[PDB]
Amino acid sequence: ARQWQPDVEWAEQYGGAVMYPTKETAHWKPPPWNDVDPPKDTLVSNLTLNFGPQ
Amino acid sequence: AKTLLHQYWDIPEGTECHRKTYAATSIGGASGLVVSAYSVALKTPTSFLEGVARTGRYTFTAAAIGAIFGLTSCISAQVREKPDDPLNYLIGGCAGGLTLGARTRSYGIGAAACAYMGLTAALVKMGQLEGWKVFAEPKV
Amino acid sequence: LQYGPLAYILGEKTTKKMTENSKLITVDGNICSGKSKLAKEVAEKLGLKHFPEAGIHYADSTTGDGKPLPVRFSGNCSLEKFYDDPKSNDGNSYRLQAWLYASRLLQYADALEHLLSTGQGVVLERSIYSDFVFLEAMYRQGFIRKQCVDHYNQVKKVTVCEYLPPHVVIYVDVPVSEVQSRIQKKGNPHEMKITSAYLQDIENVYKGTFLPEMSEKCEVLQYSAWEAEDAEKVVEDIQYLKYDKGPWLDQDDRKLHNLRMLVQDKLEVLNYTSIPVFLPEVTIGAHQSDRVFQEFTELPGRKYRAGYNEDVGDKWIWL
Amino acid sequence: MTGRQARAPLQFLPDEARSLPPPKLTDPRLAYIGFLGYCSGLIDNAIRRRPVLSAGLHRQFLYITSFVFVGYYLLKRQDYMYAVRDHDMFSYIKSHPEDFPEKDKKTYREVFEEFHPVR
Amino acid sequence: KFYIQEPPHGSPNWLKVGLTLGTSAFLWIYLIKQHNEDVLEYKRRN
Amino acid sequence: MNPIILIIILMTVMLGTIIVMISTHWLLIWIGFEMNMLAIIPIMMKKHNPRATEASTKYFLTQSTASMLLMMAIIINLMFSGQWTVMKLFNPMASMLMTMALAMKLGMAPFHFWVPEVTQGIPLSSGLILLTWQKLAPMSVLYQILPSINLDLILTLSILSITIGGWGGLNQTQLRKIMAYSSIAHMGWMTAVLLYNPTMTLLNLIIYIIMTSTMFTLFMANSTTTTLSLSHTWNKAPIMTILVLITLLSMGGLPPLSGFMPKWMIIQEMTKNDSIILPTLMAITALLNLYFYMRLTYSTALTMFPSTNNMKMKWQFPTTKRMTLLPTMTVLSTMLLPLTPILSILE
Amino acid sequence: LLDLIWLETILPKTISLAQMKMSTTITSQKGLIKLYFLSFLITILISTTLLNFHE
Amino acid sequence: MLKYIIPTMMLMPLTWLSKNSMIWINTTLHSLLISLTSLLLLNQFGDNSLNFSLTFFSDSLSTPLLILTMWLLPLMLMASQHHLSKENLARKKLFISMLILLQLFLIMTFTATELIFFYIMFEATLVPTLIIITRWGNQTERLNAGLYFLFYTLAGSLPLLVALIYIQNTMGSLNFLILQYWVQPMPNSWSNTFMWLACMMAFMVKMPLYGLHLWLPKAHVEAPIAGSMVLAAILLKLGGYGMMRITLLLNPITDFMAYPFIMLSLWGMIMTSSICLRQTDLKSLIAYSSVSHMALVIVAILIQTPWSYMGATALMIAHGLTSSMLFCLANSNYERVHSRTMILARGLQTLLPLMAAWWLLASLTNLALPPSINLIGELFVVMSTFSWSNITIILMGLNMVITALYSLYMLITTQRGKHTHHINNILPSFTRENALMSLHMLPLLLLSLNPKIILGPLY
Amino acid sequence: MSLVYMNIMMAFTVSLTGLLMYRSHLMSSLLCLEGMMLSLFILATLMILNSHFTLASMMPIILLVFAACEAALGLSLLVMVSNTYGTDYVQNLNLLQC
Amino acid sequence: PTLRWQEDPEPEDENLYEKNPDSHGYDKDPAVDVWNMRVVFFFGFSIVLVLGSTFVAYLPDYRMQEWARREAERLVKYREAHGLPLMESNCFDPSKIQLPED
């Protein structure tokens, strides 16, 4: 409509965990939107007791 | 510290030379200790020998700035024979900035360091000469 | 609202509207086969208040006037265009997908409130879990690029992990040719034009992925094709089971209080609908949104808070 | 500037503030406060989706009353503060006048200025 | 009339509006009484 | 949680701050700081994500070592001149460790690393209460021990806090780290004035608290974490845009707007001393921190980003929270330029 | 050459790149805890014995 | 003066409580009646300035510029449609009320006794202008333009505050008269050098001088017509007004310490007139014309002759009118053809036939037409600087040659020779455009008749 | 001063270094905080006893009950971490990056 | 396979002509168009410009001009009548000075 607006590429430039790249910026990731990481990935171990012949 | 900056400002400027250069190398040793302490505190160098290399690099650059700046301070004050102008320290700050840029082996860092270090060294002598109070009044 | 902390402090609990009348049952079949026949039967013979199928204009008929708003606002789904051409790259599948997802989530939250107050328990039909199954099978036909599948996966990760899975799910199996006969004897032409391998992928994923991944959260009841009407069997099977699995054992009052305050202020539910990832089938530039938004304010009810709205009334804007 | 013999705590207006006059009715600063209360009520209508410039008239009246009342008492405190500051200052002026010299009003017949013409 | 099943408010309560009008008129009358007492205290002291 | 339990815990946070404000005995000050910590931990971890667990862990370690270092300062004070009067200390060493205890307490640039970490990993209510009250209460302690401070402490920590809180903030796109960097910037402005005229510092404290309460209520208008969410707040509501504009520029501090009253009077009764190079350097870095305010403004309220459908679905519903106290704090935080003679309301 | 390229390099680019590089050196902290407490420790020691504050 | 301030307050809720398709006439009529009551101000006589309501006073440094603002407001209020008529009601009313609040802080700036009040209303002039250009710029670098704009104007004008506060608590109050009648001459140590360099450097930023000038042309070419005209005329001539006020102190050192800015100003004047000889983008030439005139103004203020000050204030008023008008002609051509470049829209003598009369008239007032106010200002600046030094007249005359050359290039390239005959959307010129041409070029010719109104207080 | 006070302060600052620099576990860090508590306790107690300042003898016992409940809060937090991971290392805190 | 958008190519470049050929510059409502031309071409010229022209045409002696003419005439008649030199130097009397000496 003849007036310029920013686009997908601008609003993805305002993205990532940082604004400006570094020589280490490949390790930071943007946070999840619940601010909840995938919880443990090594979840539970209920104990397996062997009461032996003693 | 207060002691070595007071040693640096004790000597008239003026020609009582190379004490100025040694005091400026002490300035360089202190600045390098500060930067090296924070840098090895916030890097995990992996490993310690490379950390020794990093600390040695920062202290050597800061000491070289101090040494070259003290030499050009004394030499310019002896040549121009006017111990009150700030322009000799303007030349000194630009010379220190160029040698910082050359030890970092670039051009633009050296030129911008020339400009900013020259103007700030001019401000240092200019305020010490007219009289601007160190860090406080603290009165009203 | 007469809520907040003060309602839980004065009004004692919400445990007292439980249980064995109030519950969450959810009837899920394949398309146009297990429909509101069985849902109206279990509602009218189980004493349990019904909510209809989650179409598109539920957001139109859920607040203010129940007259549905046109598809420029509540769309731009074009469901019969989806059934006719689910292959056009103009964007007509995923938009409809995410809109149906928000529709399902909205009516799920409203039914959860109507469970947590007054009873009497509700029957849902085609709930949210069938919707991620729909995206899975729709990708099995190869209609949507994998990136956008990952976007829906992210929406599913964030939204579903705040709620409680329902008590029972009545799976209804109807085979290929019987669904195909019903859809080719219904009469809706853009439903006549549907394909069959998509229905097959619905069957395959809807067997192999839903039913293992319940695992006694959402206690299942698998029914055959003509096992409908047939009402006393589903009534006796709902009555004569016992509920021992799933997170609906113990809450006790605190979880239910948090869900009561989370279901109210429905923008709390909808805060995680727009992520955004920018999805070249989904995003809309600001010009179209702005002229559609001004024309949406020009609708005679929606403009500045229908509780206070002029030109319908209500003669109390305080002089 | 600490106590100043606070004995007698913060004491939102002390006993001594009754010797100066209060701010008048329709003083301009309290009128500013009243306009700001009006704008507060108007933006209060604006936050919720109720229509602005109507449907909040009792809230208009409440916000205007609350702000005008509070600002009235604050202006009374301000006048107390500046009165006691000048009173302390002139008391210490009259304490030791011999350490504050009154310099000689030299006329310009004898005050010389170095000229330096601007061309 | 024209609304379906959810007027959440807008049906005007009458506790809160009368309470607001009463406390606000009371607050005005208190400050005017205060200002009159201050003027007369001032002309009494001086 | 129960609402009973939270009203009790908020009452205890209030109780800790009132005990710190109210006492004349050093043990009561230490118990006040500790009780404030103890109660402020379960305001965090209102959810149960690992983000809050790690954030409360970091906050606990830094805060507890700050409290024990404060107790070390008190015990040095009574190894010397022995009385429990909260007044001038009698050792430059005791004053040194006490200022470093507060510099670990409320965040200064040698000691500030925990602040953005703890403010990101929590919900906004916990961040609100921690910034406002945890930066209110130790300023009372500084106001009580002002006559015995080596000025090099407050000078160094203040300048370094302004420039670190400035330079951090050019990179962060998260809202909460932006707000914490703004916090360290105002801690520098609220601390450097202290040995000159502390009425300025306490008025700056009231200004900063009102501003930050407005900001967190506007980010509780809907739960937003990035700036992109605020572009969607544009698309769903028009007046949140203009209030983010006005309050962001008031955090920036421009002279027609009420965020300039902290800078202006402080420069005045700072340079009725003859520190001039320090005020003009502070004001240059004050020009620096306005940039990330400005890029947030440019992101949302001035340009318009592309947006997403289902906001069509969001148009019908009200944004039906209760805003806690929004309008009063807005027009009391922004239009309050022509009442700078309410400086002297304080003492 | 004079207005556009050199004036934009010397006043906007120099200041802007200096602030951006100071940002990328300050905020680029890996999220570890031993590092931050070693910063605290050397700050304490360099404030005591080198740049004195207890005088 | 307070009777000139308070109806500008009450004019602000006009647009709010007027309904749609009725706001326009109301704002036009009422701001024009304010312009009559504005021209009623002119009571100034002889000995003193007219000083009242203790914050307020009027010189003849302030009377003509104040009338210029209170007359350039409704002209702009009319000028800024056809590019936001199709926008919404809310943003329309917000735009208009933002302009009105901009006017209010402008008049507060121009009638400032106390220089701290002056600085507050100075950056208050700044803050809405950014919102105007950034929301309605109608191009793609307007964002960067506003960002550069605010950081240049603030960071230049920031330490001016510290220097004024230092003045406030080393001498006494900052009434302009008690700044006068009390000013002690300050010697040439280095702190006096920094204080002078602080104040002068802040306003050097604002004018701009040559070394800080790319501030402006991006902000001009990426702005709406309202923000562009207020920006150019009122903001740059406000910077000059403020320098004319603050130069009354620090007299006996500025001779010694005000050399190098003259050299930077004159060489920047020649380089600016040369850089606007060869650009495309018609909109930019008027911005560089403004930089040329303001460099000449800066020469006029660094010298301290009453001839120089009379020529300075005349040059300010005349170039404000001229550059504002020629911006409006540039906007009319751009709304005819949505290009912003130059060489696409050739022709335009044949079509839009009496548009040529107004291009001719505006470009000759830029030319220094031989009775024009522009010529009067430039002439007395050249006279005073020749008395300053007998060698400066080469740069002045070379400025005159190149100024005439780029003015004529703008005339005979944009609007001369051949319609490009692939265009077919340009209409005849509307009545509003010719109305704005008339509203620009009646006061300039009336001031060409009797100009002794608007010359400086050193009369 | 004395002789004993120098050794107790030396023990304090060594405990402070052990609190600040710490390698792998967090339990040892909280335990060094407990040792610093002991040092402040013993220091204030010997001060008050040598002064025969009998009046405010509240200091050591109330100092220790409060820094005890500080340690209780700390143990709750550390066991929360060790629940939601496998160990209590300084690693697993590597997320939530600056 | 890539669109990134959903909006129309906007807008139609509506010149205001061809629908109201007697219109003035702005929007198509033909009553208020006459009202606008009315209000500017009366209350901008016929009561503003011409009245301002009369008001600055004559006004007092602006910056005290004709007063200074008549005062100069009286003083020069006085100075050349009574023998005294016209415009004596030393505008302040050097009897009222105390110069520094050596």
**Edge-to-edge strand list for the sheet holding C122-125:** C49-50, C122-125, C24-28, C168-172, C219-223
Write out the two tokens for F171. 């990179």
Taking Cα atoms as reference points, which of H315, H291, H322 lies closest to residue H301? Answer: H315
Taking Cα atoms as reference points, which of F62, F132, F23 lies closest to residue F31? Answer: F23
Q: Does G7 touch chain H (CB under 8 A)?
A: yes
Contact C308 D56 (CB under 8 A): no
Q: Do residues C180 and C197 make contact, with C-beta atoms less than 8 angstroms apart?
A: no
Q: Can you give the length of chain A in residues?
A: 54
Q: Is E11 exposed, middle or buried (0-12, 13-18, 19+ CB in 10 A)?
A: exposed
Give exposure, C103-122, as e/b (b: 16+ Cβ within 10 Å): bbbbbbbbbbbbbbeebebb
Residues facing residue C283 across a β-bridge: F308
Question: Which residue is associated with the tokens 């307020």?
Answer: H56
Is the peptide bond prior to C276 cis by the omega test (within 30 degrees of 0)? Answer: yes
CA B117 vs CA B65, B89, H197: distances in Å: 11, 10, 20
Question: Which residue is associated with the tokens 């943003």?
Answer: H91
- B38 to chain G: which residues are within 8 Å by CB? 39, 42
Contact C161 A33 (CB under 8 A): no
Contact A18 G27 (CB under 8 A): yes
Amino acid at H312: A
Give, for G54, the enclosing helix (H) or strand (E).
none
> Taking the CB of residue C131, how many other CB atoms lie within 10 A of it?
20
F236-239 long-range contacts (CB < 8 A, ≥24 apart) are F236/F311, F236/F314, F236/F315, F236/F319, F237/F319, F238/H90, F239/D43, F239/D46, F239/D47
Sequence-ordered list of residues with C-beta below 8 angstroms from that of B67, at least 6 positions apart, any chain: B21, B24, B25, B28
Write out the two tokens for H92. 């329309």
Separation between Cα atoms, residue J21 and residue C64, nearest integer Å: 45
Give exposure, H153-170, as e/b (b: 16+ Cβ within 10 Å): bbbbbbbbbbbbbbbbee
**I1-86 CATH:** 1.10.287.3510
Touch between chain J and chain C (3+ CB pairs, < 8 Å)?
A: yes
H51 three-class SS: strand
H157 three-class SS: helix
Separation between Cα atoms, residue C189 and residue C273, nearest integer Å: 33
Contact G3 H271 (CB under 8 A): yes
Give, for C162, the enclosing helix (H) or strand (E).
none
Contact A33 C283 (CB under 8 A): no
Separation between Cα atoms, residue F237 and residue B76, nearest integer Å: 66
Half-sphere exposure of H97 (CA within 13 A, CB side): 16
Separation between Cα atoms, residue H419 and residue H242, nearest integer Å: 46
- D68 to chain E: which residues are within 8 Å by CB? 31
Give, for B64, the enclosing helix (H) or strand (E).
helix B48-80
D64-67 long-range contacts (CB < 8 A, ≥24 apart) are D64/D34, D64/D37, D64/D38, D65/D37, D65/E24, D65/E27, D65/E28, D66/D37, D66/E24, D66/E27, D67/D33, D67/D34, D67/D36, D67/D37, D67/D40
Q: What is the DSSP letter of J45?
A: T
Separation between Cα atoms, residue D80 and residue B110, nearest integer Å: 60
Q: What is the DSSP letter of H421?
A: S
Write out the two tokens for J8. 């129309």
Separation between Cα atoms, residue B135 and residue F158, nearest integer Å: 12
Choose among F2, F305, F318: nearest Cβ to C286: F305
Taking Cα atoms as reference points, which of C75, C15, C11, C2 lies closest to residue C254? Answer: C15
Taking Cα atoms as reference points, which of C4, H169, J47, F96 lies closest to residue G44? Answer: F96
Strand H56-58 versus strand H50-52 pairing type? antiparallel
Q: Is B113 exposed, middle or buried (0-12, 13-18, 19+ CB in 10 A)?
A: buried
> Taking the CB of residue C269, how many other CB atoms lie within 10 A of it?
22
Q: End-to-end alpha-carbon separation of chain I, Å?
A: 45
Q: Give the gap in angstroms from C-alpha A15 to the nearest C-alpha of chain J.
A: 17
Separation between Cα atoms, residue H163 and residue H179, nearest integer Å: 14
Taking Cα atoms as reference points, which of C283, C292, G29, F223 lies closest to residue A12? Answer: C283
Q: Report the interhelical angle of F175-191 vs F261-268 (nearest 10°).
A: 20
Give exposure, D41-53, as e/b (b: 16+ Cβ within 10 Å): bbbbbbbbbbbbe
Q: Report the interhelical angle of H115-135 vs H142-168 (nearest 10°).
A: 170
Question: Which residue is associated with the tokens 């209920």?
Answer: A46
- A20 to chain G: which residues are within 8 Å by CB? 20, 23-24
Secondary structure of chain F as H, E, C letters: CCHHHHHHHHHHHHHHHHHHHHCCCHHHHHHHHHHHHHHHCCCCCCCCCHHHHHHHHHHHHHHHHHHHHHHHHHHHHHHCCCCCCCCCCCCHHHHHHHHHHHHHHCCCCCCCCHHHHHHHCCCHHHHHHHHHHHHHHHHHHHHHCHHHCCHHHHHHHHHHHHHHHHHCCCCECCHHHHHHHHHHHHHHHHHCCCCCCHHHHHHHHHHHHHHHHHHHHHHCCCCCCCCHHHHHHHHHCCHHHHHHHHHHHHHHCCCCCCCCHHHHHHHHCCCCCCCCHHHHHHHHHHHHHHHHHHHHHHHHHHCCCCEECCHHHHCCCCCCCCCCCCHHHHHHHCCCCCCHHHHHHCC
> Taking the CB of residue E1, how many other CB atoms lie within 10 A of it?
5
- Chains in touch with H (3+ beta-carbon pairs under 8 Å) read A, B, D, F, G, J
C127 three-class SS: coil
Write out the two tokens for H182. 């009390």
Separation between Cα atoms, residue F292 and residue F297, nearest integer Å: 8
Taking Cα atoms as reference points, which of C92, C194, C179, C189 lies closest to residue C143? Answer: C92
Greatest Cα-to-Cα distance within chain G, rounded to the nearest angstrom: 55
- D66 to chain E: which residues are within 8 Å by CB? 24, 27
Q: Report the interhelical angle of H236-246 vs H190-206 (nearest 10°).
A: 160
Write out the two tokens for H275. 């850089």
- F68 to chain I: which residues are within 8 Å by CB? 33, 36-37, 40, 67
Q: Does H144 touch chain G (CB under 8 A)?
A: no
> Taking the CB of residue D14, how many other CB atoms lie within 10 A of it?
15
Q: Do residues F302 and A7 make contact, with C-beta atoms less than 8 angstroms apart?
A: no
Taking Cα atoms as reference points, which of H196, H397, H381 lies closest to residue H304? Answer: H381
Separation between Cα atoms, residue F336 and residue D37, nearest integer Å: 12
Sequence-ordered list of residues with C-beta below 8 angstroms from that of F186, at least 6 positions apart, any chain: F204, F208, F262
> Taking the CB of residue I47, how many other CB atoms lie within 10 A of it?
17
Touch between chain C and chain F (3+ CB pairs, < 8 Å)?
A: yes
Half-sphere exposure of D78 (CA within 13 A, CB side): 15
Contact F298 H146 (CB under 8 A): yes
Separation between Cα atoms, residue C234 and residue C231, nearest integer Å: 6
Q: Do residues F333 and F247 make contact, with C-beta atoms less than 8 angstroms apart?
A: yes
Q: Do residues E24 and D61 make contact, with C-beta atoms less than 8 angstroms apart?
A: yes
Question: Which residue is associated with the tokens 């009259």?
Answer: D94
Per DSSP, chain D holds a count of helices (H) and strands (E) of 2, 0
Residues facing residue F307 across a β-bridge: C284
CA H156 vs CA F283, H152, H161, H215: distances in Å: 12, 6, 10, 11
Q: Can you give the length of chain I in residues?
A: 98
- Helix ranges restricted to H, H83-189: 89-110, 115-135, 142-168, 176-179
Strand C219-223 versus strand H56-58 pairing type? unpaired
Residues facing residue C170 across a β-bridge: C27, C221
Q: Give the gap in angstroms from C-alpha F292 to the nearest C-alpha of chain I.
A: 17
Question: Which residue is associated with the tokens 């001039």?
Answer: F276
Q: Does A8 touch chain J (CB under 8 A)?
A: yes
Q: Do residues F302 and F241 make contact, with C-beta atoms less than 8 angstroms apart?
A: no
Q: Give the gap in angstroms from C-alpha B18 to the nearest C-alpha of chain F.
A: 31
Write out the two tokens for C198. 């998509």
Sequence-ordered list of residues with C-beta below 8 angstroms from that of D96, at least 6 positions apart, any chain: none
Q: Do residues H330 and H282 make contact, with C-beta atoms less than 8 angstroms apart?
A: yes
Phi and psi torsions of C231, nearest 5°: -105, -35
- A18 to chain G: which residues are within 8 Å by CB? 27
Q: Do residues F12 and F39 make contact, with C-beta atoms less than 8 angstroms apart?
A: yes
Q: Do residues H63 and H111 make contact, with C-beta atoms less than 8 angstroms apart?
A: no
Phi and psi torsions of C66, nearest 5°: -85, -5
Please, what is the Cα angle at C199 between C217 and C225, to 5 degrees? 65
User: Following DSSP, what letter does each residue of I4-53 receive, concatenated?
Assistant: HHHHHHHHHHHHHHHHHS--SBSHHHHHHHHHHHHHHHHHHHHHHHHHT-
Taking Cα atoms as reference points, which of F45, F225, F167 lies closest to residue A30? Answer: F225
Taking Cα atoms as reference points, which of C54, C213, C173 lies closest to residue C125? Answer: C54
Half-sphere exposure of I59 (CA within 13 A, CB side): 26
Q: Do residues F186 and F112 make contact, with C-beta atoms less than 8 angstroms apart?
A: no
Residue in I with minimal Cα distance to A37: I95
Contact A2 J11 (CB under 8 A): yes
Amino acid at A16: G
Strand C24-28 versus strand C219-223 pairing type? unpaired
Separation between Cα atoms, residue H207 and residue H211, nearest integer Å: 11
Touch between chain D and chain E (3+ CB pairs, < 8 Å)?
A: yes
Amino acid at H417: G
Separation between Cα atoms, residue I84 and residue F23, nearest integer Å: 41
Choose among A1, A8, A34: nearest Cβ to C158: A34
Residue in I with minimal Cα distance to A28: I97
Give exposure, H247-265, as e/b (b: 16+ Cβ within 10 Å): bebbebbbbeebeebbebb
Is the peptide bond prior to C120 cis by the omega test (within 30 degrees of 0)? Answer: yes
Which of G19, G25, G27, G50 to probe the F interface (max F CBs under 10 A)?
Answer: G27
Give, for C169, the enclosing helix (H) or strand (E).
strand C168-172
Residue in G with minimal Cα distance to I97: G31
Secondary structure of H255-317 as H, E, C letters: HHHCCHHHHHHHHHHHHHHHHCCCCCCCHHHHHHHHHHHHHHHHHHHHCCCHHHHHHHHHHHH
Q: Give the gap in angstroms from C-alpha G5 to the nearest C-alpha of chain F.
A: 23
Is the peptide bond prior to A35 cis by the omega test (within 30 degrees of 0)? Answer: no
> Taking the CB of residue B40, how many other CB atoms lie within 10 A of it?
20
Please, what is the Cα angle at F220 between F216 and F221, to 5 degrees? 120
Quick one: how far is CA G29 from the chain centroid? 12
D31 three-class SS: helix
Give, for C98, the enclosing helix (H) or strand (E).
helix C94-116
Q: Do residues H366 and H402 make contact, with C-beta atoms less than 8 angstroms apart?
A: no
Separation between Cα atoms, residue D46 and residue D59, nearest integer Å: 13
- Tell me the technique behind this structure: cryo-EM
Q: Is C71 exposed, middle or buried (0-12, 13-18, 19+ CB in 10 A)?
A: middle
- G40 to chain I: which residues are within 8 Å by CB? 20
Q: End-to-end alpha-carbon separation of chain A, Å?
A: 86
Q: Can you give the length of chain H in residues?
A: 459
Give exposure, F318-333, as e/b (b: 16+ Cβ within 10 Å): ebbeebeebbbbbbbb
Contact I93 G33 (CB under 8 A): yes
Separation between Cα atoms, residue C267 and residue C263, nearest integer Å: 9
CA F312 vs CA C100, C288, D49: distances in Å: 13, 12, 17
- Helix ranges restricted to H, chain J: 30-43, 49-57, 66-81
Q: Do residues C170 and C25 make contact, with C-beta atoms less than 8 angstroms apart?
A: yes
Separation between Cα atoms, residue F79 and residue I42, nearest integer Å: 12
With the C-alpha atoms ordered I25, I30, I34, I36, is the resulting torsion angle positive or negative?
positive
Choose among I84, I95, I97: nearest Cβ to A40: I84
Secondary structure of C204-241 as H, E, C letters: HHHHHCHHHHHCCCCEEEEECCCCCCCCHHHHHHHHCC
Secondary structure of C104-122 as H, E, C letters: HHHHHHHHHHHHHCCCCCE
Residues facing residue C124 across a β-bridge: C26
Please, what is the Cα angle at C278 between C275 and C282, to 5 degrees? 95
C246-249 long-range contacts (CB < 8 A, ≥24 apart) are C246/C165, C246/C167, C246/C216, C246/C217, C246/C218, C246/C219, C247/C164, C247/C165, C247/C217, C248/C164, C248/C167
With the C-alpha atoms ordered H42, H47, H52, H56, is the resulting torsion angle positive or negative?
positive
Quick one: how far is CA H80 from the chain centroid? 18
Taking Cα atoms as reference points, which of F69, F210, F225 lies closest to residue F136? Answer: F210
Separation between Cα atoms, residue C176 and residue C193, nearest integer Å: 16
Domain-wise residue ranges, chain I: 1-86
